[PDB]
Amino acid sequence: TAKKFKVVTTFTIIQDIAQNIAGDVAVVESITKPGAEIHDYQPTPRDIVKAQSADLILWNGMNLERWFEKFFESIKDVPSAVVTAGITPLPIREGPYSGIANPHAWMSPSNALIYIENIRKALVEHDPAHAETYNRNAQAYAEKIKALDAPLRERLSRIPAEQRWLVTSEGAFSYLAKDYGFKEVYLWPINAEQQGIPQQVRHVIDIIRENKIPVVFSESTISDKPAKQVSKETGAQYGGVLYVDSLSGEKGPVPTYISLINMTVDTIAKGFGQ
Ligand SMILES: [Zn+2]
């Protein structure tokens, strides 16, 4: 093919969803590499000229990419589209960012359907020559995503409701916890350069000890040391790494949005003895 419509995304979750909609007619690339910390990412000149070569830039909004506004004002004549219109935000519950939208809306499979619609609408609006392809690819992919919820809901429901305590590092799982009826505990409400983490470690250690919570987790773009200290000082198992803010590379263990949701739920479920 002569040349394909070029789409660039802020991070890897959006890249994979968008690439499933784009199929063979457009190439979708993430600005951030898999594994990069996305909230406070610092773009380089390489990143700017990459977005500058695109025909469309997709971003999450909802207070995720603190770096996006400054980055985008460096780009000339490239349209952007936020992919989260129509999602009901959940407010952050604790800390300095209390009350503002929790950005991690893709961790509810139901919300992924809205991500799909907004990305489809953006691709059709900006590359209308391939509307039928974007529309059919969005339809087929939405059907897959609709089918994601049922086995996960069933698996997690076998954990007695009173025992559903999800203890993580970043409070990045609020939308998944809402869907499947978990109560939330975390070492920091949202990724940021911040004081107070060693103090919250002790506070969470209390809550683990009081409620005899069996398991604690970290996440794949942040340090596992606080979660491992929590499990060391309590009885609780270190349940491993959850996947939320990044996919892996294409030959890694979490190459797709579908694998991210499925593997995060599997790891949570195994932590509770299924
Ligand atoms: Zn995050």
Side-chain angles (χ1 to χ4, degrees):
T1 303
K3 197 184 131 294
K4 299 209 212 143
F5 197 69
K6 273 209 273 175
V7 178
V8 153
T9 69
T10 47
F11 77 122
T12 53
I13 278 69
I14 299 181
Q15 185 279 334
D16 180 72
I17 296 171
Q19 189 61 83
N20 274 278
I21 300 163
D24 298 333
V25 299
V27 173
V28 188
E29 296 179 327
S30 178
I31 292 163
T32 55
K33 80 151 168 71
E37 200 296 292
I38 67 189
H39 298 253
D40 292 311
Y41 185 72
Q42 276 146 334
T44 67
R46 292 136 86 127
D47 299 331
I48 294 174
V49 302
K50 185 164 141 194
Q52 187 60 71
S53 77
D55 305 308
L56 176 60
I57 298 166
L58 307 176
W59 63 304
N60 192 80
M62 294 181 76
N63 316 112
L64 179 66
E65 307 98 333
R66 306 194 173 101
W67 52 274
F68 187 72
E69 203 206 356
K70 163 177 148 57
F71 176 82
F72 188 60
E73 222 58 17
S74 280
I75 307 307
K76 184 219 200 153
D77 290 0
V78 179
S80 66
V82 73
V83 300
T84 51
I87 289 160
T88 292
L90 284 179
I92 295 164
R93 304 286 180 209
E94 286 169 0
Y97 301 100
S98 204
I100 76 172
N102 185 324
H104 303 97
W106 62 87
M107 293 305 293
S108 160
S110 192
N111 285 340
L113 298 177
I114 296 170
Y115 278 82
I116 288 167
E117 172 61 16
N118 290 327
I119 291 162
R120 185 208 59 81
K121 197 232 72 185
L123 291 166
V124 172
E125 160 185 15
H126 288 101
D127 188 33
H130 292 125
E132 170 161 36
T133 292
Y134 297 136
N135 280 337
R136 290 195 274 86
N137 291 348
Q139 274 174 90
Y141 187 64
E143 303 285 21
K144 287 186 189 194
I145 298 304
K146 278 188 233 261
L148 219 58
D149 177 84
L152 311 179
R153 191 173 294 273
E154 196 214 48
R155 180 130 175 239
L156 294 171
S157 63
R158 281 112 58 154
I159 303 157
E162 300 77 13
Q163 325 293 125
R164 288 177 207 166
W165 293 86
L166 184 43
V167 187
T168 61
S169 293
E170 184 183 30
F173 301 88
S174 305
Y175 294 84
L176 183 158
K178 179 184 179 202
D179 285 18
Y180 305 124
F182 280 74
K183 284 123 182 102
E184 250 167 296
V185 181
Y186 33 79
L187 301 177
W188 50 94
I190 191 172
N191 286 359
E193 187 48 53
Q194 66 193 282
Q195 300 292 288
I197 293 168
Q199 290 69 47
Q200 180 61 7
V201 166
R202 302 324 308 235
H203 188 295
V204 167
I205 282 174
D206 290 346
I207 300 204
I208 295 287
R209 280 171 187 162
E210 280 157 351
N211 296 249
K212 295 311 200 253
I213 303 179
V215 64
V216 59
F217 303 91
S218 70
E219 305 89 57
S220 72
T221 68
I222 50 87
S223 167
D224 62 4
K225 271 107 181 67
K228 275 174 172 164
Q229 185 194 349
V230 172
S231 83
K232 178 135 180 105
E233 295 317 306
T234 69
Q237 187 189 29
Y238 176 63
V241 300
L242 301 182
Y243 317 102
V244 51
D245 281 354
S246 177
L247 313 176
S248 72
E250 307 70 24
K251 295 185 224 47
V254 193
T256 65
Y257 171 70
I258 282 167
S259 70
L260 174 140
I261 292 299
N262 282 339
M263 295 191 188
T264 287
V265 173
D266 182 52
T267 296
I268 294 179
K270 288 162 148 59
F272 286 93
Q274 260 190 39

PDB file of all heavy atoms in Angstrom, residues 57-78:
ATOM      1  N   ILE A  57      -3.945  12.064  16.817  1.00  0.00           N
ATOM      2  CA  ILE A  57      -3.410  11.728  18.135  1.00  0.00           C
ATOM      3  C   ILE A  57      -4.572  11.383  19.059  1.00  0.00           C
ATOM      4  O   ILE A  57      -5.526  12.162  19.175  1.00  0.00           O
ATOM      5  CB  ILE A  57      -2.585  12.889  18.716  1.00  0.00           C
ATOM      6  CG1 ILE A  57      -1.377  13.185  17.835  1.00  0.00           C
ATOM      7  CG2 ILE A  57      -2.082  12.544  20.133  1.00  0.00           C
ATOM      8  CD1 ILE A  57      -0.701  14.544  18.163  1.00  0.00           C
ATOM      9  N   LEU A  58      -4.495  10.222  19.722  1.00  0.00           N
ATOM     10  CA  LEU A  58      -5.528   9.794  20.658  1.00  0.00           C
ATOM     11  C   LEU A  58      -4.981   9.820  22.074  1.00  0.00           C
ATOM     12  O   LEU A  58      -3.853   9.378  22.315  1.00  0.00           O
ATOM     13  CB  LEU A  58      -6.030   8.376  20.358  1.00  0.00           C
ATOM     14  CG  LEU A  58      -6.513   8.092  18.942  1.00  0.00           C
ATOM     15  CD1 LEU A  58      -6.874   6.627  18.827  1.00  0.00           C
ATOM     16  CD2 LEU A  58      -7.713   8.991  18.606  1.00  0.00           C
ATOM     17  N   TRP A  59      -5.794  10.305  23.018  1.00  0.00           N
ATOM     18  CA  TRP A  59      -5.374  10.345  24.410  1.00  0.00           C
ATOM     19  C   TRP A  59      -6.552  10.038  25.327  1.00  0.00           C
ATOM     20  O   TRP A  59      -7.724  10.091  24.923  1.00  0.00           O
ATOM     21  CB  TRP A  59      -4.730  11.689  24.766  1.00  0.00           C
ATOM     22  CG  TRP A  59      -5.580  12.915  24.667  1.00  0.00           C
ATOM     23  CD1 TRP A  59      -6.273  13.368  23.577  1.00  0.00           C
ATOM     24  CD2 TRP A  59      -5.778  13.884  25.700  1.00  0.00           C
ATOM     25  NE1 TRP A  59      -6.906  14.557  23.878  1.00  0.00           N
ATOM     26  CE2 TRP A  59      -6.618  14.890  25.177  1.00  0.00           C
ATOM     27  CE3 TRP A  59      -5.334  13.992  27.024  1.00  0.00           C
ATOM     28  CZ2 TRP A  59      -7.017  15.990  25.930  1.00  0.00           C
ATOM     29  CZ3 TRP A  59      -5.733  15.093  27.770  1.00  0.00           C
ATOM     30  CH2 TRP A  59      -6.568  16.069  27.224  1.00  0.00           C
ATOM     31  N   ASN A  60      -6.218   9.687  26.576  1.00  0.00           N
ATOM     32  CA  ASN A  60      -7.233   9.227  27.514  1.00  0.00           C
ATOM     33  C   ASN A  60      -8.025  10.379  28.116  1.00  0.00           C
ATOM     34  O   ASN A  60      -9.247  10.267  28.294  1.00  0.00           O
ATOM     35  CB  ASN A  60      -6.589   8.414  28.639  1.00  0.00           C
ATOM     36  CG  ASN A  60      -7.614   7.661  29.482  1.00  0.00           C
ATOM     37  OD1 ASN A  60      -8.098   6.596  29.088  1.00  0.00           O
ATOM     38  ND2 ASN A  60      -7.918   8.193  30.660  1.00  0.00           N
ATOM     39  N   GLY A  61      -7.347  11.480  28.461  1.00  0.00           N
ATOM     40  CA  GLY A  61      -8.010  12.491  29.272  1.00  0.00           C
ATOM     41  C   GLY A  61      -8.242  11.982  30.695  1.00  0.00           C
ATOM     42  O   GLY A  61      -7.547  11.098  31.193  1.00  0.00           O
ATOM     43  N   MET A  62      -9.250  12.562  31.349  1.00  0.00           N
ATOM     44  CA  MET A  62      -9.648  12.191  32.721  1.00  0.00           C
ATOM     45  C   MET A  62      -8.482  12.255  33.708  1.00  0.00           C
ATOM     46  O   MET A  62      -8.361  11.427  34.614  1.00  0.00           O
ATOM     47  CB  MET A  62     -10.286  10.811  32.757  1.00  0.00           C
ATOM     48  CG  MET A  62     -11.608  10.696  32.047  1.00  0.00           C
ATOM     49  SD  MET A  62     -12.229   9.005  32.212  1.00  0.00           S
ATOM     50  CE  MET A  62     -12.809   9.019  33.890  1.00  0.00           C
ATOM     51  N   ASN A  63      -7.629  13.256  33.541  1.00  0.00           N
ATOM     52  CA  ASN A  63      -6.487  13.499  34.415  1.00  0.00           C
ATOM     53  C   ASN A  63      -5.429  12.404  34.322  1.00  0.00           C
ATOM     54  O   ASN A  63      -4.696  12.190  35.291  1.00  0.00           O
ATOM     55  CB  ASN A  63      -6.903  13.651  35.890  1.00  0.00           C
ATOM     56  CG  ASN A  63      -8.127  14.527  36.086  1.00  0.00           C
ATOM     57  OD1 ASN A  63      -9.185  14.047  36.479  1.00  0.00           O
ATOM     58  ND2 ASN A  63      -7.974  15.815  35.861  1.00  0.00           N
ATOM     59  N   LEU A  64      -5.331  11.676  33.200  1.00  0.00           N
ATOM     60  CA  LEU A  64      -4.315  10.620  33.142  1.00  0.00           C
ATOM     61  C   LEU A  64      -2.951  11.188  32.779  1.00  0.00           C
ATOM     62  O   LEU A  64      -1.994  11.099  33.560  1.00  0.00           O
ATOM     63  CB  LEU A  64      -4.700   9.535  32.132  1.00  0.00           C
ATOM     64  CG  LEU A  64      -3.654   8.412  32.000  1.00  0.00           C
ATOM     65  CD1 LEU A  64      -3.497   7.565  33.302  1.00  0.00           C
ATOM     66  CD2 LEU A  64      -3.939   7.496  30.794  1.00  0.00           C
ATOM     67  N   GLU A  65      -2.840  11.759  31.585  1.00  0.00           N
ATOM     68  CA  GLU A  65      -1.556  12.199  31.038  1.00  0.00           C
ATOM     69  C   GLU A  65      -1.357  13.647  31.452  1.00  0.00           C
ATOM     70  O   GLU A  65      -1.772  14.571  30.747  1.00  0.00           O
ATOM     71  CB  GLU A  65      -1.540  12.042  29.521  1.00  0.00           C
ATOM     72  CG  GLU A  65      -1.915  10.640  28.964  1.00  0.00           C
ATOM     73  CD  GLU A  65      -3.392  10.535  28.509  1.00  0.00           C
ATOM     74  OE1 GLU A  65      -4.245  11.275  29.032  1.00  0.00           O
ATOM     75  OE2 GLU A  65      -3.704   9.689  27.648  1.00  0.00           O
ATOM     76  N   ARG A  66      -0.721  13.863  32.615  1.00  0.00           N
ATOM     77  CA  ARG A  66      -0.483  15.235  33.069  1.00  0.00           C
ATOM     78  C   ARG A  66       0.370  16.008  32.074  1.00  0.00           C
ATOM     79  O   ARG A  66       0.362  17.249  32.070  1.00  0.00           O
ATOM     80  CB  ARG A  66       0.194  15.237  34.443  1.00  0.00           C
ATOM     81  CG  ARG A  66      -0.550  14.438  35.499  1.00  0.00           C
ATOM     82  CD  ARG A  66      -0.050  14.744  36.916  1.00  0.00           C
ATOM     83  NE  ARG A  66      -0.899  14.097  37.913  1.00  0.00           N
ATOM     84  CZ  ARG A  66      -0.592  12.969  38.547  1.00  0.00           C
ATOM     85  NH1 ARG A  66       0.562  12.360  38.304  1.00  0.00           N
ATOM     86  NH2 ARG A  66      -1.438  12.455  39.432  1.00  0.00           N
ATOM     87  N   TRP A  67       1.074  15.289  31.223  1.00  0.00           N
ATOM     88  CA  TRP A  67       2.022  15.829  30.267  1.00  0.00           C
ATOM     89  C   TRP A  67       1.392  16.161  28.920  1.00  0.00           C
ATOM     90  O   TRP A  67       2.066  16.749  28.067  1.00  0.00           O
ATOM     91  CB  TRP A  67       3.141  14.813  30.076  1.00  0.00           C
ATOM     92  CG  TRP A  67       2.661  13.407  29.730  1.00  0.00           C
ATOM     93  CD1 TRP A  67       2.290  12.423  30.602  1.00  0.00           C
ATOM     94  CD2 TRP A  67       2.520  12.849  28.416  1.00  0.00           C
ATOM     95  NE1 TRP A  67       1.931  11.284  29.911  1.00  0.00           N
ATOM     96  CE2 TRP A  67       2.071  11.520  28.567  1.00  0.00           C
ATOM     97  CE3 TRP A  67       2.746  13.342  27.126  1.00  0.00           C
ATOM     98  CZ2 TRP A  67       1.841  10.678  27.473  1.00  0.00           C
ATOM     99  CZ3 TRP A  67       2.512  12.515  26.047  1.00  0.00           C
ATOM    100  CH2 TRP A  67       2.066  11.192  26.225  1.00  0.00           C
ATOM    101  N   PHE A  68       0.125  15.806  28.696  1.00  0.00           N
ATOM    102  CA  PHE A  68      -0.392  15.883  27.334  1.00  0.00           C
ATOM    103  C   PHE A  68      -0.567  17.321  26.856  1.00  0.00           C
ATOM    104  O   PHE A  68      -0.252  17.629  25.699  1.00  0.00           O
ATOM    105  CB  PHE A  68      -1.714  15.139  27.175  1.00  0.00           C
ATOM    106  CG  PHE A  68      -2.157  15.077  25.741  1.00  0.00           C
ATOM    107  CD1 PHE A  68      -1.493  14.257  24.846  1.00  0.00           C
ATOM    108  CD2 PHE A  68      -3.183  15.882  25.277  1.00  0.00           C
ATOM    109  CE1 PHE A  68      -1.872  14.219  23.496  1.00  0.00           C
ATOM    110  CE2 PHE A  68      -3.572  15.844  23.930  1.00  0.00           C
ATOM    111  CZ  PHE A  68      -2.916  15.010  23.050  1.00  0.00           C
ATOM    112  N   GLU A  69      -1.088  18.213  27.703  1.00  0.00           N
ATOM    113  CA  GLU A  69      -1.408  19.551  27.207  1.00  0.00           C
ATOM    114  C   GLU A  69      -0.158  20.260  26.696  1.00  0.00           C
ATOM    115  O   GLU A  69      -0.175  20.883  25.625  1.00  0.00           O
ATOM    116  CB  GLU A  69      -2.100  20.382  28.291  1.00  0.00           C
ATOM    117  CG  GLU A  69      -2.948  21.524  27.691  1.00  0.00           C
ATOM    118  CD  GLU A  69      -3.141  22.734  28.613  1.00  0.00           C
ATOM    119  OE1 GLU A  69      -2.692  22.705  29.783  1.00  0.00           O
ATOM    120  OE2 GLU A  69      -3.754  23.725  28.149  1.00  0.00           O
ATOM    121  N   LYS A  70       0.934  20.189  27.458  1.00  0.00           N
ATOM    122  CA  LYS A  70       2.177  20.832  27.039  1.00  0.00           C
ATOM    123  C   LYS A  70       2.741  20.158  25.798  1.00  0.00           C
ATOM    124  O   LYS A  70       3.226  20.828  24.876  1.00  0.00           O
ATOM    125  CB  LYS A  70       3.190  20.794  28.189  1.00  0.00           C
ATOM    126  CG  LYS A  70       4.639  21.044  27.787  1.00  0.00           C
ATOM    127  CD  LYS A  70       5.530  21.042  29.034  1.00  0.00           C
ATOM    128  CE  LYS A  70       6.927  20.519  28.745  1.00  0.00           C
ATOM    129  NZ  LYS A  70       7.593  21.291  27.673  1.00  0.00           N
ATOM    130  N   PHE A  71       2.675  18.828  25.757  1.00  0.00           N
ATOM    131  CA  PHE A  71       3.142  18.088  24.591  1.00  0.00           C
ATOM    132  C   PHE A  71       2.368  18.493  23.342  1.00  0.00           C
ATOM    133  O   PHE A  71       2.956  18.784  22.295  1.00  0.00           O
ATOM    134  CB  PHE A  71       2.994  16.597  24.869  1.00  0.00           C
ATOM    135  CG  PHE A  71       3.350  15.689  23.712  1.00  0.00           C
ATOM    136  CD1 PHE A  71       4.674  15.355  23.460  1.00  0.00           C
ATOM    137  CD2 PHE A  71       2.354  15.092  22.949  1.00  0.00           C
ATOM    138  CE1 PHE A  71       5.010  14.486  22.446  1.00  0.00           C
ATOM    139  CE2 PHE A  71       2.680  14.214  21.920  1.00  0.00           C
ATOM    140  CZ  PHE A  71       4.016  13.908  21.671  1.00  0.00           C
ATOM    141  N   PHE A  72       1.039  18.536  23.444  1.00  0.00           N
ATOM    142  CA  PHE A  72       0.205  18.807  22.280  1.00  0.00           C
ATOM    143  C   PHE A  72       0.411  20.222  21.767  1.00  0.00           C
ATOM    144  O   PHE A  72       0.336  20.461  20.559  1.00  0.00           O
ATOM    145  CB  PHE A  72      -1.268  18.579  22.625  1.00  0.00           C
ATOM    146  CG  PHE A  72      -2.193  18.661  21.435  1.00  0.00           C
ATOM    147  CD1 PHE A  72      -2.039  17.807  20.360  1.00  0.00           C
ATOM    148  CD2 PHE A  72      -3.209  19.593  21.404  1.00  0.00           C
ATOM    149  CE1 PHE A  72      -2.890  17.884  19.255  1.00  0.00           C
ATOM    150  CE2 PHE A  72      -4.070  19.677  20.303  1.00  0.00           C
ATOM    151  CZ  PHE A  72      -3.904  18.818  19.235  1.00  0.00           C
ATOM    152  N   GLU A  73       0.653  21.178  22.654  1.00  0.00           N
ATOM    153  CA  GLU A  73       0.852  22.520  22.125  1.00  0.00           C
ATOM    154  C   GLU A  73       2.171  22.653  21.364  1.00  0.00           C
ATOM    155  O   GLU A  73       2.349  23.646  20.651  1.00  0.00           O
ATOM    156  CB  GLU A  73       0.724  23.546  23.256  1.00  0.00           C
ATOM    157  CG  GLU A  73      -0.072  24.863  22.908  1.00  0.00           C
ATOM    158  CD  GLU A  73      -1.553  24.715  22.410  1.00  0.00           C
ATOM    159  OE1 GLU A  73      -2.204  23.648  22.577  1.00  0.00           O
ATOM    160  OE2 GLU A  73      -2.078  25.726  21.858  1.00  0.00           O
ATOM    161  N   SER A  74       3.071  21.664  21.447  1.00  0.00           N
ATOM    162  CA  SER A  74       4.278  21.615  20.626  1.00  0.00           C
ATOM    163  C   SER A  74       4.038  21.028  19.241  1.00  0.00           C
ATOM    164  O   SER A  74       4.943  21.088  18.399  1.00  0.00           O
ATOM    165  CB  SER A  74       5.360  20.772  21.311  1.00  0.00           C
ATOM    166  OG  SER A  74       6.023  21.520  22.308  1.00  0.00           O
ATOM    167  N   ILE A  75       2.881  20.413  19.004  1.00  0.00           N
ATOM    168  CA  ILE A  75       2.555  19.762  17.735  1.00  0.00           C
ATOM    169  C   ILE A  75       1.741  20.720  16.878  1.00  0.00           C
ATOM    170  O   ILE A  75       0.831  21.384  17.381  1.00  0.00           O
ATOM    171  CB  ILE A  75       1.759  18.462  17.970  1.00  0.00           C
ATOM    172  CG1 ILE A  75       2.488  17.547  18.950  1.00  0.00           C
ATOM    173  CG2 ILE A  75       1.463  17.782  16.660  1.00  0.00           C
ATOM    174  CD1 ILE A  75       3.908  17.280  18.570  1.00  0.00           C
ATOM    175  N   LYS A  76       2.027  20.762  15.575  1.00  0.00           N
ATOM    176  CA  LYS A  76       1.366  21.681  14.654  1.00  0.00           C
ATOM    177  C   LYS A  76       0.475  20.915  13.678  1.00  0.00           C
ATOM    178  O   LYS A  76       0.922  19.963  13.038  1.00  0.00           O
ATOM    179  CB  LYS A  76       2.400  22.509  13.884  1.00  0.00           C
ATOM    180  CG  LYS A  76       1.779  23.551  12.972  1.00  0.00           C
ATOM    181  CD  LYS A  76       2.514  23.675  11.652  1.00  0.00           C
ATOM    182  CE  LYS A  76       2.207  25.009  10.969  1.00  0.00           C
ATOM    183  NZ  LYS A  76       3.335  25.422  10.091  1.00  0.00           N
ATOM    184  N   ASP A  77      -0.787  21.322  13.581  1.00  0.00           N
ATOM    185  CA  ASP A  77      -1.688  20.855  12.526  1.00  0.00           C
ATOM    186  C   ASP A  77      -1.945  19.351  12.591  1.00  0.00           C
ATOM    187  O   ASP A  77      -2.122  18.694  11.561  1.00  0.00           O
ATOM    188  CB  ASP A  77      -1.151  21.234  11.138  1.00  0.00           C
ATOM    189  CG  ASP A  77      -1.233  22.732  10.866  1.00  0.00           C
ATOM    190  OD1 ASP A  77      -1.705  23.478  11.755  1.00  0.00           O
ATOM    191  OD2 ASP A  77      -0.812  23.163   9.767  1.00  0.00           O
ATOM    192  N   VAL A  78      -1.965  18.773  13.785  1.00  0.00           N
ATOM    193  CA  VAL A  78      -2.342  17.377  13.962  1.00  0.00           C
ATOM    194  C   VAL A  78      -3.533  17.329  14.915  1.00  0.00           C
ATOM    195  O   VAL A  78      -3.402  17.701  16.086  1.00  0.00           O
ATOM    196  CB  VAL A  78      -1.190  16.511  14.497  1.00  0.00           C
ATOM    197  CG1 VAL A  78      -1.675  15.059  14.673  1.00  0.00           C
ATOM    198  CG2 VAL A  78       0.016  16.584  13.552  1.00  0.00           C
TER     199      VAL A  78
END
